[PDB]
Every structure is written in structure tokens, then in C-alpha cells.
Amino acid sequence: MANVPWAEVCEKFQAALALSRVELHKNPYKSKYSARALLEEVKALLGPAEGPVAQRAVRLAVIEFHLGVNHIDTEELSAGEEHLVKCLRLLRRYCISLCIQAQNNLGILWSEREEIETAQAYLESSEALYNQYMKEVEKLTEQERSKRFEKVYTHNLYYLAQVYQHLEMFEKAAHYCHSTLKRQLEHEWAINAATLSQFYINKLCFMEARHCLSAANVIFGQTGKELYHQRKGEIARCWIKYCLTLMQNAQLSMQARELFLLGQHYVFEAKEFFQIDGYVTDHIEVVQDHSALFKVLAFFETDMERRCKMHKRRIAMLEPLTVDLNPQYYLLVNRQIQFEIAHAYYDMMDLKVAIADRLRDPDSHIVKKINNLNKSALKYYQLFLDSLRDPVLRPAMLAKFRVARLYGKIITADPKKELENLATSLEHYKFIVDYCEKHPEAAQEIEVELELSKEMVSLLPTK
């Protein structure tokens, strides 16, 4: 009886790799266990009871890899981690192939472990050994022993980017997954381009964002081609990040018309695909960003009126979609859309006071439009307080100031209703401030303004 020759280890390699490869397809309670039983039969066939004879070293390294895949098959990886760290110690005492296989095993076990600090420390040590390899002091190859190193480099870099994005670490993780995108398109990419564009939204450089993002669009066009599509939601979030980039560029510009034209084309194609791909919550977000871009995209005086009735038609298309279901989720999104229509009525009232400042106020159709708008906004604020119990510092104070101005300037009734309405607004925020015991931001000067208003409307209508 001699030792294990090359033919026996090659037929064992072929059999084990072929059955594990046809088992990882996942076309069951025993077939995966039959692959694990064959591999533990090889484990018993090992029999452990320059350097030494390299056949034993190669077979122990590949059987440590097979023990690791058996442990990830059985989800009891403690003995697998023990055997692999002993393999790491014996390869330290005992190079390309062994260290890259040990590093892939370490990466997959510390990705299984989900402990952040140990996984990131082991990934930094494998990266340090990678930089040491870049320092640099057979029969049937895949591609010159280079394609295997290429794919495990991309896999290890994507997994360390995942461990880094489990932390905050945004700049270095973003650079690392951009390197994975470059290394992949030189030889999941939609979500990786999505988080690149989201980080660049969090950043300030948008030209490189548009460069890599249009590269993502043209490789979506030239992907080349089953059941799990996900492209609808993926480019839906891409259109979402497109309008968020439009939001931040309009915000930095406001605090020419080519932005209007690109907004027209991109949000038109976006709204077309958003009508294609569902939805309920996505459509709430759609009319949210549509109304918000209609607020931020200001042109002129007479251009404001058509834009206001445009986003009024937008919220009038929002409204009858969520009437039939009505969960408490509808109550929460009803509170958000009442805040949105409150902002829309604030913009409409700025339009109306500009019109009353520059043009004639007591005209018939203008009075009809403003009293219809006042009645609809009173109903909308009635629903907004119906979100509160009829029988956190910023939006409550903003809603109080908005309903205080609504109590103030919209009526020309018998001259006591506006006075009692501003009085109850003052007492409402007095109850708010003795209920919260906290200091406000602008409500103190709007309270002293409403107190002086209480004095002058206590004096002047009586005269």
C-alpha cells in the first residue's frame, strides 16, 4: 500500500467538485446532505494519523475549503472557524494559492459571523497581504492563474465594502465599491450605482455622479440578454435619485432654463415609468416630489398661476387613489399630504397677496377663487386636526403659524371673528408652551405680533 497518487486525487477532485457544483444549482432534505456525506467521506479518507510532500498540503487546504462549505451547509461553523484558523497558523508556519484560498475562506466565514470589528480587522489584514503581494518583495488552468485571482479580488472587495457600509465609513466604502464596479465592467451593479449616486447626493460633486450614472444607464442599454426582474424598482429608484439631484441643484441655485428643460424631459419619462411600475407609497412619493419641484421651479408672476393649478391637479390626482382602503397607514400619509397641501396653500396665498398688492382685489372671479380656496383649505386643515385627537417642535409651530395667518388674513366678516380666532391661536400656543415646558424659535415673536394684533383689533373695530 502506497500513498494517494495523482490519479486518485484527481478523480476525487472531479467527483466532489462535480457533485457540489450540480448541488449548488439548487434544482429537498437529503441531496445536499448527500453531497455533505460524500465530502465527509473524503474527510475520513484523508487520514492524518520548500517543505514536506505538497500533495498532503494541497489536499488539506482543499479539504479545509470543503469543510468550510460543509459548515456553511450545516450552519454550525464553529469547528470550521477553528480548523480554518489552525490552517492559517500552519500556513504561517508553512505564496499565492494557499493564502488566496485562506483569504476567501476567512472572508466568507467572517461574512457569516456578522461581528463587525473582527470581520473588518480580518478584511484589513487580507488587504494588507494584498498590498504585500502588489509589493511582491498547470494541466487545465482557468486563465493563467489570473481569472481566479481576479474574481476573488472582486468578491473580497465587494464583501469588505458591505462590511464597511454596515458601519458609516462612507467615503472609503464608496471608493471601494466604485472600484468593484470598475473591475466588474472591465470584465447588483444597479444597486451599487444607486448607492454611489446617493452618496454623491450626500456629497457635493455631481459631475462625476452624472458620469458614472450615465455610464450605468448606457450599460443598462447594452446589458445584453430571467424571472426575478427587479429592473422596474431599480430604475424607479434611479428616477427618484434623478429628481433628488434636481432638488439639490435647484436648492443650491435658489439658495436657468436648461434645468427646466432637463426637468421636463427627465421627470416626464420618470412619471411615465412611475405610472408603469405601481404603486401606492411610490405614487405618494411621486406626487410629493412633483409638487415639491413645482414649488421650487419658480419663473414669473403669471407663470406662478398655471404652476399652482398644475400642482393642484397633481394633488387632486393624489386624492382619490387612497380613499377605498383607508388603514392607519392612510392616516399617517394623510397627515403628510395635509402638510403638503398646507405648503401648497401657503404658496397660493403668497401668490394671492402678490396679486392683491399689484392688481385689483375686489373683482368677481378672483373673490370667487379665493373664497373657494379658503373653504377647501379650511376643510384641509380640519382633516389635519382630525389627524390629531378630536374627541416635533418645528412642524407643529409651522402649522400653528400657518393656521394663525389663515385665521388672520382670509376673512372680511363681522369684525370680531378674526379677533377671537387670533385669541384662540394665542391661547393654543400658550397651552402648547405650558404643556411642553420648552422654548420655541419664531413663535415668541409671532406671539408678540399676535398680542399687538389682539390690542389693535380689540381697539379699532370698536371704533
Numbering used by the authors: 1 to 27, 32 to 53, 84 to 128, 134 to 176, 192 to 241, 248 to 285, 301 to 330, 392 to 527, ...
Which text from the study accompanies this structure?
Kinesins are a superfamily of microtubule (MT)-based molecular motors that play important roles in cellular functions such as mitosis, cell motility, and intracellular transport. The kinesin motor domain is the MT-binding engine that drives these activities, converting the chemical energy of ATP binding and hydrolysis into mechanical force. Recently, it has been demonstrated that a subset of kinesin superfamily members, including kinesin-2s, −3 s, −8 s, and −12 s, are sequestered by kinesin-binding protein (KBP; KIF1BP; KIAA1279), which inhibits MT track attachment by their motor domains and, thus, blocks their MT-related functions. Here we present cryo-electron microscopy (cryo-EM) structures of KBP alone and of KBP bound to the motor domain of the human mitotic kinesin KIF15 (a 110 kDa complex).
The 3D structure of the ~72 kDa KBP at 4.6 Å resolution was determined using cryo-EM data collected using a Volta phase plate (VPP), and an atomic model was calculated. Our structure revealed that KBP is a right-handed α-solenoid protein. Nine pairs of anti-parallel α-helices (αHP1 [α-helical pair 1] to αHP9) are broken by a single ‘linker α-helix’ (LαH) and ‘linker loop’ (LL) in the centre of the fold separating KBP into N-terminal and C-terminal subdomains. The four predicted TPR motifs contribute exclusively to α-helical pairs in the N-terminal subdomain. The supercoiling α-helical pairs form concave and convex faces linked by short and long loops that constitute the two edges of the α-solenoid. In contrast to the shorter loops, the longer loops (more than seven residues) tend to be partially disordered, show low sequence homology between KBP orthologues in different species, and are mainly found in the N-terminal subdomain (e.g. L2, L6, and L10). The LL is the longest (62 residues) and is thus unique in the KBP structure because it is reasonably conserved and mainly ordered, with visible corresponding density clearly bridging the N- and C-terminal subdomains. Despite this clear ordered density, this loop was not modelled due to low homology to available structures and a lack of consensus in secondary structure prediction. In spite of this lack of consensus, density in this region suggests that part of this loop may form further α-helical structures. The KBP-alone model is incompatible with KIF15_MD6S binding, due to clashes with L14 in the C-terminal subdomain and αHP3a, αHP4a, and L8 in the N-terminal subdomain.
